[PDB]
Amino acid sequence: TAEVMSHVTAHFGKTLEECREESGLSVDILDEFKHFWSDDFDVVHRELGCAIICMSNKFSLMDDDVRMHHVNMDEYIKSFPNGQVLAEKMVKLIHNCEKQFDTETDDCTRVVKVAACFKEDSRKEGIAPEVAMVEAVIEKY
Ligand SMILES: [Mg+2]
Ligand SMILES: [Mg+2]
Ligand SMILES: [Mg+2]
C-alpha cells in the first residue's frame, strides 16, 4: 500500500547523499529521493540507476547479479509498519520489471529502466505514494 511504500522510500532515500559522488547524480537531476514519485519526475538517467545500485548495496537489497535480493527485500519491507501487505506484491512487481530488461548489458541503465517500470506499475496498482506522504514520514528511524 501507499503508506508502507512511503516508509520504504523515506528510509531507503536517506542513503542518496552518500551515493551521489560515485554515481554522478547531481542535485539538479534529483534533489530529494522522495521526488522519485512525483508525476513531474522522469525516471531515466543512467546516473540514478548507478545511485540505486549504491543505495541498494548499503542495505544488501541487491545480489551479486545486480538484481534484487528477494529474501532481503522481503525482510526489508516487512521491517516497516504493515509491511507484510506490500512485501510479496512489491517483490513481484520488481521482479516482473527485471525480467523485461534482462537484455540490457549496462547494469546502471538496466536498473533505472527497472525503476521506471516499477514506478509505472506501482501507479497502475495504486500503491504509488505522493511526495507529500513520503515527506510526512522522513523523520522516522
Ligand atoms: Mg561514477
Ligand atoms: Mg548521460
Ligand atoms: Mg552486497
62: β partners? 68
With H, G, I as helix, E, B as strand and everything else as coil, classify residue 67.
Answer: coil
| Resolution of the structure, angstroms | 1.6
Distance from the alpha carbon of residue 29 to the mean position of ligand 1, in angstroms: 15
Distance from the alpha carbon of residue 22 to the mean position of ligand 1, in angstroms: 4
Distance from the alpha carbon of residue 27 to the mean position of ligand 1, in angstroms: 15
CA distance readout (Å), 134 to 11, 38, 94, 115: 9, 11, 20, 17
Q: Which ligand is located closest to the Cα atom of residue 61?
A: 3
Distance from the alpha carbon of residue 60 to the mean position of ligand 2, in angstroms: 26
What are the grid coordinates assigned to 77, written together? 519491507
Q: What CATH class does 1-141 carry?
A: mainly alpha
Q: How crowded is residue 41: how many other Cβ atoms within 10 Å of its Cβ?
A: 15
